[PDB]
Amino acid sequence: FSVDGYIRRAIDCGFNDLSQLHCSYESFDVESGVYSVSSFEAKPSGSVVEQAEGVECDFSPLLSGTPPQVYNFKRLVFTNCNYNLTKLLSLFSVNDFTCSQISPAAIASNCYSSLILDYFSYPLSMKSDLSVSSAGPISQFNYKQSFSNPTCLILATVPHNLTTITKPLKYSYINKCSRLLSDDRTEVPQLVNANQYSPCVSIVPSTVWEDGDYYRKQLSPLEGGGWLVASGSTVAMTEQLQMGFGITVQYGTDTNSVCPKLEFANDTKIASQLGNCVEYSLYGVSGRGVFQNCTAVGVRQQRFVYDAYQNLVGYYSDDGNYYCLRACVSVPVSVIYDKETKTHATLFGSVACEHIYGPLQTPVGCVLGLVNSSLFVEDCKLPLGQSLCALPDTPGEMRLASIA
Amino acid sequence: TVDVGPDSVKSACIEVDIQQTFFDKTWPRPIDVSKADGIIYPQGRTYSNITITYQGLFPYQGDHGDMYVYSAGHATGTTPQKLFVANYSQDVKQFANGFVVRIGAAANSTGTVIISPSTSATIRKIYPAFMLGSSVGNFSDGKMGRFFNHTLVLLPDGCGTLLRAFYCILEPRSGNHCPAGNSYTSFATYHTPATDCSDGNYNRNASLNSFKEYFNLRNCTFMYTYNITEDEILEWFGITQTAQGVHLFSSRYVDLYGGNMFQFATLPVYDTIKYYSIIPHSIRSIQSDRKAWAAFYVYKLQPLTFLLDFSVDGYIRRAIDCGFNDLSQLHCSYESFDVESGVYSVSSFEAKPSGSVVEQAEGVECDFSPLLSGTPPQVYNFKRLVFTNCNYNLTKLLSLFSVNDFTCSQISPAAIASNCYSSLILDYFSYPLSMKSDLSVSSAGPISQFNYKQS
Amino acid sequence: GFGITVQYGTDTNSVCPKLEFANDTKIASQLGNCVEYSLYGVSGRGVF
Amino acid sequence: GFQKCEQLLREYGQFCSKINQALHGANLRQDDSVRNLFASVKSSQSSPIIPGFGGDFNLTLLEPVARSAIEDLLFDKVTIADPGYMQGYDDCMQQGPASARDLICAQYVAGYKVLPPLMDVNMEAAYTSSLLGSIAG
Amino acid sequence: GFQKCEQLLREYGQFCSKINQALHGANLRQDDSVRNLFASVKSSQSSP
Amino acid sequence: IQRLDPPEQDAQIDRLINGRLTTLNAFVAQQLVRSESAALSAQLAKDKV
Amino acid sequence: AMQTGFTTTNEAFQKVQDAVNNNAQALSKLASELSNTFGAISASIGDIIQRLDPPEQDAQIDRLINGRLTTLNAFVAQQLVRSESAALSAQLAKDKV
């Protein structure tokens, strides 16, 4: 920016390595020297994908008979299957579908180790009682979602023509659940744990007969003694049954085999892209790398082989082969710059020139912009390493000189 | 529900002789972590040729566990009689995080026939039977070991060729020597080798059928079987429970000779298992053909950090229990089985509580009466009750109203009703429910801007 | 509507749920021991 | 390489410029340290080392074999990972990591680079060899 | 001693191993410094 | 732990962790600086003796 | 007698190995810290982006940034300490020659 504010000169900081240098010092004039700059990135040349492909995950149970009350929720656990939430959601009039610790787009598109679906009858009038922040009876004694795993909650109404789902007489819930200790002075509220059933489930009937019913069980000494007690409550039934569906997903306890179905191209196979840098998604595991055919190590049944820094370093494919996985590797870059001549050369340290006058292979890497001179110096200003030096022609190209 | 075959039609159970003295043996086989005993392999992955620490459910180094041994029943020559068992059905344990079992460790050694201490025989592997569930209590005569509601039963059958897992309600039968009947002692399972273990056709329901003599199986939700190839190889079995169900682990399908356990099944058991017991088993052998059966050992699991040595082939052959002792802590901190000589500081030996002391204000109830008398104020004229030096009970107040929406901020729900405070301030007012959202922190409407705002 | 605001340390935290006390939770009876404590809402571990 | 991250990284100021400049200076410091150190070991005048140097005093241990015998032994007995100054990039692809926690191959993965020293081995050997020959005189 | 904290601490890597090793080395350094210093103050021969 | 549930409890514990990890890193950095200084000083003491 | 010297009892020899080990430790900080999550749901930025929307995605990426910026600052601080020490040591070597 000039004094009058106009821009008269600029550097595109991603144009080349010399430009990166000027930008890092925020100046158009930097001192002579050899500087490290951002590496020349390897970029993906394609992608490989492997997903479980097969059986649909089965939501049929859900659709047949009278759903349980909130404290007796039923659980469907899906593993090793293709999921489709639209397939289930489309059967209900959804009133409220929200997600936590997972985006909306993600719930319907990511692969999981497992998907757990908890379904139950639930009045919509008590919607708020399922909130994480709630201190009412549902969240304290009946049903609580995980705080650790990503979850979604769907509240939906059963359509008049979905005749396979029947209604209970009333909606019901536990409004009290507690233990009376052996002294019969102290009463301890028994709160429901996330993803678990309340201890009072065994004393509370599948349908509370009437609001205010009190239940009691004498506990054995192995259960700590005393009494387990509970109180039920009811909500009048609606014209259409309202149901809640909790969804909990886990991301890495097993192969993430619960995936949306995918139509596979045969150009996304690993064997067809060996040696290339590709993006990968293997049963929910993703990143970038290079696959190589190699000797199997690790336990085959476990599929993914990890190193001591927890990187994925190998994989057993469903095509029967074991592949080594290497990172797409970046190519080191150092800029050799001479301020007086306004010239430069690029050193790719540690890199053979097969990956890059043409390029010159030197003891410290591959260098472009230098010409081999078979000349010696003592007075080296731009040392390259080992006993090599860049020597400006003064302008011409820099010479590669040896230090005497 | 699942059809699990017909009910037993017998009017009586076989009499069970419980003589614990005969089973009070000392044959210790504690977990040797350095030999990787009891280890469940990290589940979602493998490693090769590395040493790393890992957090997971493991048995403790040095844990002796609980030894259980099955025996031959009583006989007279060629006619087997009464069953002979240990007091196992009444010995109910807390499940906690699950357990691992050492099975057949003594196989091929010369052992004892438990029922006849002077009789020796080659020891053969036998599989443990388990009963697991959410609630326990007693039977009709007061003996313990009854499980209520759905109970998970892991019952090996077919003379050791299958594992049968089922989740069902066990209804005690009322016949002679049965749990709801007359001279009941303990239920037990059995098989009769003479008719059940023919060289060709093994009776795959022999143990199920004996189980059924003591209990009627009702509302079974599942019954699964797993096949076991016969051998005399030491193997490990394990059980854990998560939101996904009960996980059954075994070394025999992946690392048969090595011993690492891998998951082979998940059962749709979602209620929490709190209790378990060993179902005693007695073999109705003839007197002339009694065998010594290997003891099995049950070890409890807990969330421990182990140093795990993964071989090139990925199996864990060696490990360190990083909390066992100070030397073990050292190896774990360097993530190595070999550390240099020296003097190192390690975690301190913690003092642990030996009890607790509590002092609370005890006295007057905090008084919510004002709240209940007369016309409540409008939202801009809210009234405030400040409670100090009193015993509070929110249920006492909440129970008087039909609560439509109760939420908390910067305090948990459990905490609002259970913690001590310097003060509790209660602001009450008339308020239409139709304007519920106007009380939200994020609201820019008239209530939050001009009438009432929370801290 | 009922708003509830709670404060945790301007005074002794004397607004507590009622508790039935055992006499083995007294301080005098456990001197010299490491115990957990909860004294008018103040808690931690220590030796009295 | 993730653009969202880079976008957030920018709000921390010129963080990476500081990292690079601090290390650049730190690295120049060794080239200057080495240059100064060797300038001082350097002899003005020296006698040639010939086999037999030392007379009755057995100095074969120190004579160049070129590094001396003790010097090669010193290096052979110290476990040093090979940084691959000429073609390490490729060694780590065609062979892969030598072992668990291979910090040389980690360079191309993690985003760091080990730079070569100011002088090659034969030059350093030349300095100490000329030094040996200067001692008596 | 709180398990929840320890569980979260683990997500920061082997933090404590680094603290312990850094101090262990720093402490060895003084024992070596002292040993070397006194080895040099030490006399070969001395009068009473 | 006594006051908050996991989604918020976590954030609060994490603040304490970050502060304590920072403190320990600062401590260690200084013990390394101080031990390096003392070691140089020890060599000065050696020369003076 | 010194031909047999480069062993476990040779203090000068261990100092040579330790200088080598110190270089390795410096690099291990960078190699080992990228696997940490620093409270994040994943050490992978790609996992964060794939699972979360911007208002939360941001917070998770930011945890990884803070942890990595911290790691690099620690690394640099040590390279400056180690290079200062080596430079002083180099002057000692100069004096000894």
Ligand SMILES: *[C@@H]1O[C@H](CO)[C@@H](O[C@@H]2O[C@H](CO)[C@@H](O[C@@H]3O[C@H](CO[C@H]4O[C@H](CO)[C@@H](O)[C@H](O)[C@@H]4O[C@H]4O[C@H](CO)[C@@H](O)[C@H](O)[C@@H]4O)[C@@H](O)[C@H](O[C@H]4O[C@H](CO)[C@@H](O)[C@H](O)[C@@H]4O[C@H]4O[C@H](CO)[C@@H](O)[C@H](O)[C@@H]4O)[C@@H]3O)[C@H](O)[C@H]2NC(C)=O)[C@H](O)[C@H]1NC(C)=O
């Ligand atoms: C996850 O789960 C969800 C839910 O299960 C899946 O989403 C469904 O996907 C299917 C496709 O696989 C999709 O079917 C499509 O429906 C449209 C809508 O047509 C309806 O209305 C017209 C009005 O004119 C009617 O004529 C027609 O018959 C349909 O009527 C329906 O409703 C009436 C009652 O009102 C009933 O009486 C009817 O029986 C019927 O139920 C169709 O137009 C569309 O047809 C095209 O594709 C089919 C493929 O078989 C092809 O045969 C047709 O000729 C036509 O294809 C031509 O046109 C397309 C462009 O549209 C072009 O690309 C082709 O090349 C041809 O030129 C088809 O039948 C259904 O609606 C989706 N449902 C929901 C809720 O989203 C989702 O796919 C799953 N995900 C995964 C990964 O599996």
Ligand SMILES: *[C@@H]1O[C@H](CO)[C@@H](O[C@@H]2O[C@H](CO)[C@@H](O[C@@H]3O[C@H](CO[C@H]4O[C@H](CO)[C@@H](O)[C@H](O)[C@@H]4O[C@H]4O[C@H](CO)[C@@H](O)[C@H](O)[C@@H]4O)[C@@H](O)[C@H](O[C@H]4O[C@H](CO)[C@@H](O)[C@H](O)[C@@H]4O[C@H]4O[C@H](CO)[C@@H](O)[C@H](O)[C@@H]4O)[C@@H]3O)[C@H](O)[C@H]2NC(C)=O)[C@H](O)[C@H]1NC(C)=O
């Ligand atoms: C915080 O504030 C809350 C709210 O104030 C406190 O919670 C209350 O705690 C009391 C106990 O202190 C609890 O009372 C218990 O109620 C049950 C329910 O019985 C009702 O239904 C049965 C149906 O068969 C009726 O028969 C019975 O009369 C009750 O009917 C009520 O409603 C009808 C209208 O529908 C009215 O006409 C009635 O008058 C009545 O209001 C009782 O079963 C229970 O009884 C047991 O305890 C009493 C103690 O005095 C004892 O005398 C009884 O014999 C019986 O004890 C035996 O059984 C227990 C096991 O249950 C065993 O442990 C004993 O050893 C004996 O073998 C008692 O009356 C009330 O319901 C709670 N309310 C709420 C809303 O939670 C809370 O305690 C406070 N916290 C603190 C720390 O103080």
Ligand SMILES: *[C@@H]1O[C@H](CO)[C@@H](O[C@@H]2O[C@H](CO)[C@@H](O[C@@H]3O[C@H](CO[C@H]4O[C@H](CO)[C@@H](O)[C@H](O)[C@@H]4O)[C@@H](O)[C@H](O[C@H]4O[C@H](CO)[C@@H](O)[C@H](O)[C@@H]4O)[C@@H]3O)[C@H](O)[C@H]2NC(C)=O)[C@H](O)[C@H]1NC(C)=O
């Ligand atoms: C988890 O497991 C537990 C333990 O098994 C179950 O609790 C048992 O529940 C059953 C019933 O659900 C109890 O059995 C009997 O229930 C009768 C209910 O009476 C009504 O229904 C009967 C049906 O025929 C009608 O005839 C009657 O008119 C009523 O309409 C009680 O009346 C019975 O009482 C008898 O025993 C008592 C004992 O004191 C005597 O005082 C009575 O006079 C009479 O003889 C009996 O209670 C059974 O007792 C409960 N067991 C225990 C240990 O408490 C849980 O239900 C199960 N949970 C779930 C969710 O499935």
Ligand SMILES: *[C@@H]1O[C@H](CO)[C@@H](O[C@@H]2O[C@H](CO)[C@@H](O[C@@H]3O[C@H](CO[C@H]4O[C@H](CO)[C@@H](O)[C@H](O)[C@@H]4O)[C@@H](O)[C@H](O[C@H]4O[C@H](CO)[C@@H](O)[C@H](O)[C@@H]4O)[C@@H]3O)[C@H](O)[C@H]2NC(C)=O)[C@H](O)[C@H]1NC(C)=O
């Ligand atoms: C009671 O007695 C029985 C036998 O009477 C013992 O069973 C033997 O146990 C040993 C050790 O577990 C088994 O030996 C292992 O055999 C494996 C495969 O053997 C099969 O395949 C090889 C060819 O690959 C054949 O030559 C062999 O005959 C079998 O057909 C080997 O792979 C194992 O080697 C693996 O582990 C060893 C270390 O143990 C490593 O050194 C190897 O490199 C390799 O990793 C091993 O050799 C033996 O086969 C079992 N017998 C039977 C019949 O199966 C019971 O263990 C014993 N019970 C008790 C409690 O002691």
Ligand SMILES: CC(=O)N[C@@H]1[C@@H](O[C@@H]2O[C@@H](C)[C@@H](O)[C@@H](O)[C@@H]2O)[C@H](O[C@@H]2O[C@H](CO)[C@H](O)[C@H](O[C@]3(C(=O)O)C[C@H](O)[C@@H](NC(C)=O)[C@H]([C@H](O)[C@H](O)CO)O3)[C@H]2O)[C@@H](CO)O[C@H]1O
């Ligand atoms: C006259 C007759 O047929 N008697 C039978 C017993 O044999 C005779 O008496 C005994 C003392 C021996 O001297 C025999 O040589 C003699 O003929 C027969 O005895 C059983 O013999 C076995 C050894 O073969 C041993 O002595 C049996 O005693 C025990 C045992 O096996 O150690 C004692 C145990 O405490 C008991 N266990 C329990 C839990 O009670 C067992 C058990 O009752 C049997 O193993 C059941 O099969 O017996 C000794 O009884 C006897 C049973 O075979 O029957 C007599 O009719």
Ligand SMILES: *[C@@H]1O[C@H](CO)[C@@H](O[C@@H]2O[C@H](CO)[C@@H](O[C@@H]3O[C@H](CO)[C@@H](O)[C@H](O[C@H]4O[C@H](CO)[C@@H](O)[C@H](O)[C@@H]4O)[C@@H]3O)[C@H](O)[C@H]2NC(C)=O)[C@H](O)[C@H]1NC(C)=O
């Ligand atoms: C030994 O144990 C096994 C357990 O592993 C047990 O297996 C059960 O056998 C029964 C049959 O004896 C199976 O029940 C059948 O399953 C088929 C499945 O298609 C049904 O079609 C059959 O229905 C017909 O018969 C019914 C009999 O009442 C009629 O009511 C019905 O209307 C039909 O006519 C029937 O349900 C059962 O599923 C398996 N169980 C398992 C878990 O595999 C076996 O019976 C035991 N054997 C003995 C001798 O006890």
Ligand SMILES: Nc1nc(=O)c2nc(CNc3ccc(C(=O)N[C@@H](CCC(=O)O)C(=O)O)cc3)cnc2[nH]1
């Ligand atoms: N029916 C039957 N089943 C068996 O399992 C059985 N086992 C034995 C032998 N059991 C054992 C078990 C361990 C040791 C043993 O050598 N233990 C060591 C101590 C191990 C330790 O505590 O670390 C010892 O020296 O006693 C001996 C015999 C004998 N008869 C049997 N009979």
Ligand SMILES: *[C@@H]1O[C@H](CO)[C@@H](O[C@@H]2O[C@H](CO)[C@@H](O)[C@H](O)[C@H]2NC(C)=O)[C@H](O)[C@H]1NC(C)=O
């Ligand atoms: C498993 O890891 C060990 C390291 O613990 C490897 O052994 C090293 O192999 C290299 C090969 O050049 C030698 O230079 C090292 O000196 C060996 N170290 C030890 C401690 O022996 C072993 O080869 C690895 N096995 C496989 C199949 O990769």
Ligand SMILES: *[C@@H]1O[C@H](CO)[C@@H](O[C@@H]2O[C@H](CO)[C@@H](O)[C@H](O)[C@H]2NC(C)=O)[C@H](O)[C@H]1NC(C)=O
């Ligand atoms: C079942 O038998 C076992 C084993 O004999 C009993 O456990 C023993 O109980 C005594 C009681 O003083 C203890 O001293 C022993 O140390 C216990 N043994 C072991 C191995 O722990 C058990 O209590 C009996 N259970 C029932 C219900 O009768």
Ligand SMILES: *[C@@H]1O[C@H](CO)[C@@H](O[C@@H]2O[C@H](CO)[C@@H](O)[C@H](O)[C@H]2NC(C)=O)[C@H](O)[C@H]1NC(C)=O
């Ligand atoms: C176990 O299954 C039975 C049948 O599927 C359930 O239904 C009861 O069956 C008995 C059979 O004699 C009938 O007398 C009852 O009237 C039936 N009750 C109902 C409500 O239909 C039984 O409820 C199931 N038990 C459990 C605990 O699920």
Ligand SMILES: *[C@@H]1O[C@H](CO)[C@@H](O[C@@H]2O[C@H](CO)[C@@H](O)[C@H](O)[C@H]2NC(C)=O)[C@H](O)[C@H]1NC(C)=O
């Ligand atoms: C577990 O083992 C049983 C018994 O070997 C298998 O059942 C046999 O399957 C064959 C298949 O041709 C039949 O011919 C036999 O008649 C079956 N036997 C019986 C007793 O039914 C069973 O399939 C095996 N299970 C698995 C999962 O492999």
Ligand SMILES: *[C@@H]1O[C@H](CO)[C@@H](O)[C@H](O)[C@H]1NC(C)=O
């Ligand atoms: C149910 O199906 C009948 C069939 O004619 C249709 O007329 C009716 O509108 C459908 N109802 C709903 C709610 O879709």
Ligand SMILES: *[C@@H]1O[C@H](CO)[C@@H](O)[C@H](O)[C@H]1NC(C)=O
């Ligand atoms: C690869 O995909 C093409 C797409 O049409 C198909 O024609 C070809 O047969 C496929 N090859 C194999 C091996 O399936």
Ligand SMILES: *[C@@H]1O[C@H](CO)[C@@H](O)[C@H](O)[C@H]1NC(C)=O
């Ligand atoms: C991988 O290598 C093995 C042997 O080294 C070979 O037989 C197999 O076919 C190769 N697989 C591929 C995909 O080239």
Ligand SMILES: *[C@@H]1O[C@H](CO)[C@@H](O)[C@H](O)[C@H]1NC(C)=O
């Ligand atoms: C430069 O050319 C000379 C030819 O005499 C050759 O010996 C030397 O190795 C070359 N240098 C490089 C870096 O190629």
Ligand SMILES: *[C@@H]1O[C@H](CO)[C@@H](O)[C@H](O)[C@H]1NC(C)=O
């Ligand atoms: C447990 O025992 C008591 C007396 O011993 C008896 O009254 C009670 O009914 C028993 N419980 C069961 C479930 O039979």
